[PDB]
Write an enzyme that holds these catalytic residues in place. Structure first.
Site, PDB file in Angstrom:
ATOM      1  N   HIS A  44      11.350  -4.027 -67.428  1.00 56.21           N
ATOM      2  CA  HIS A  44      10.060  -3.420 -67.771  1.00 56.21           C
ATOM      3  C   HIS A  44       9.678  -3.621 -69.238  1.00 56.21           C
ATOM      4  O   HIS A  44       8.503  -3.452 -69.610  1.00 56.21           O
ATOM      5  CB  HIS A  44       9.991  -1.954 -67.337  1.00 56.21           C
ATOM      6  CG  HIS A  44      10.476  -0.950 -68.337  1.00 56.21           C
ATOM      7  ND1 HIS A  44      11.687  -0.280 -68.181  1.00 56.21           N
ATOM      8  CD2 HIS A  44       9.853  -0.450 -69.422  1.00 56.21           C
ATOM      9  CE1 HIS A  44      11.759   0.590 -69.173  1.00 56.21           C
ATOM     10  NE2 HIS A  44      10.684   0.513 -69.962  1.00 56.21           N
ATOM     11  N   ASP A  93      15.385  -2.820 -62.493  1.00 54.64           N
ATOM     12  CA  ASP A  93      14.924  -2.887 -63.873  1.00 54.64           C
ATOM     13  C   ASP A  93      16.019  -3.508 -64.722  1.00 54.64           C
ATOM     14  O   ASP A  93      16.804  -2.820 -65.403  1.00 54.64           O
ATOM     15  CB  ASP A  93      14.534  -1.501 -64.362  1.00 54.64           C
ATOM     16  CG  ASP A  93      13.722  -1.493 -65.638  1.00 54.64           C
ATOM     17  OD1 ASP A  93      13.305  -2.596 -66.085  1.00 54.64           O
ATOM     18  OD2 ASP A  93      13.541  -0.397 -66.214  1.00 54.64           O
ATOM     19  N   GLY A 186      11.402   3.308 -76.063  1.00 49.40           N
ATOM     20  CA  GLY A 186      11.987   2.518 -77.131  1.00 49.40           C
ATOM     21  C   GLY A 186      13.495   2.390 -77.021  1.00 49.40           C
ATOM     22  O   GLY A 186      14.069   1.439 -77.563  1.00 49.40           O
ATOM     23  N   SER A 188      14.771   2.077 -73.976  1.00 50.81           N
ATOM     24  CA  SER A 188      14.805   1.258 -72.776  1.00 50.81           C
ATOM     25  C   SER A 188      15.425  -0.091 -73.015  1.00 50.81           C
ATOM     26  O   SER A 188      15.200  -0.708 -74.066  1.00 50.81           O
ATOM     27  CB  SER A 188      13.390   1.068 -72.263  1.00 50.81           C
ATOM     28  OG  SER A 188      12.859   2.358 -72.014  1.00 50.81           O
ATOM     29  N   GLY A 189      16.231  -0.528 -72.062  1.00 47.51           N
ATOM     30  CA  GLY A 189      16.905  -1.806 -72.172  1.00 47.51           C
ATOM     31  C   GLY A 189      18.264  -1.708 -72.832  1.00 47.51           C
ATOM     32  O   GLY A 189      19.091  -2.622 -72.668  1.00 47.51           O
TER      33      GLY A 189
END
Ligand SMILES: COc1cccc(C(=O)O)c1OCCc1cc(-c2ccc3c(c2)[C@H](N)CO3)cc(C(C)C)c1
Length: 236
Positions: A44, A93, A186, A188-189
């Protein structure tokens, strides 16, 4: 990260900051080094990204203010998004970045192992989420890499808190009943890293949730062990 504390240099050496360079340069997402030219992150993160040309991967960063016009970074050769990905809340994701050159390993940048083959029955009791994301709603990206220890919750309990979503075994949840600590926009990942027998493993990828650190609304992460076949195939 909500309710966390500042990390120090070398504490989370697999953590990277993925920047976009257009229309401004900013931190876009976190990621984890899993091989000499491979970053594991969230699909995402690439919403509206026209090509890998506008990305930069910075490793060995503690403070975002460290990044200047002469700070070295890796170009991104390829972005590999899972072919079943649609939206963060629906799963899949996960994405890989293949870097333009290899990462030389040092105390500030090194890979994290995936959850080991044979470790299905391992109960992870020491999990930490890290990142430069928001510490509250309507915040900004933080300067110093933050960390917070979060307990895993069962998929059964997580499903009861998200009755409007399908919480699958390709996801894992983590949070406190009364909230207070969580990942946010922020982060995320980036990694959900768990230490077992004194070895850190990449158990989750920060993905989504309802708000940040709300009571009875745990953070939802991509369950990395369920993607080992996919990761190994794309990186072999
Ligand atoms: C187009 O949007 C984006 C494009 C590229 C990257 C991102 C990103 O996620 O950084 C992005 O934002 C997605 C929307 C969003 C996510 C999240 C959130 C992210 C991670 C996370 C949680 C919540 C859970 N507490 C557990 O872990 C929060 C907000 C608001 C409420 C502040 C908004």
């Amino acid at each position: 990260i909500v309710g966390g504390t500042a990390s120090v240099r070398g504490e989370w050496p697999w953590q990277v900051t993925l920047h976009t360079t257009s229309p401004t340069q900013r931190h876009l997402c976190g990621g984890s080094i899993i091989g000499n030219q491979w970053i594991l992150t969230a699909a995402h993160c690439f919403y509206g990204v026209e090509s890998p040309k506008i990305l930069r991967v910075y490793s060995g960063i503690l403070n975002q203010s460290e990044i200047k016009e002469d700070t070295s970074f890796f170009g991104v050769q390829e972005i590999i998004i899972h072919d079943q990905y649609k939206m963060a809340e629906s799963g899949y994701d996960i994405a890989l970045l293949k870097l333009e050159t290899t990462v030389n390993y040092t105390d500030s940048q090194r890979p994290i192992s995936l959850p080991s083959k044979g470790d299905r029955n391992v109960i992870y009791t020491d999990c930490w989420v890290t990142g430069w994301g928001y510490r509250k709603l309507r915040d900004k990206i933080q300067n110093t890499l933050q960390k917070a220890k979060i307990p895993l919750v069962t998929n059964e309990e997580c499903q009861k808190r998200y009755r409007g979503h399908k919480i699958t075994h390709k996801m894992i949840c983590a949070g406190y009943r009364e909230g207070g600590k969580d990942a946010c926009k922020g982060d995320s990942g980036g990694p959900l890293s768990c230490k077992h027998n004194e070895v850190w493993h990449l158990v989750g990828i920060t993905s989504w949730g309802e708000g940040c650190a709300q009571r009875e609304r745990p953070g939802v992460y991509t369950n990395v062990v369920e993607y080992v076949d996919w990761i190994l195939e794309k990186t072999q």
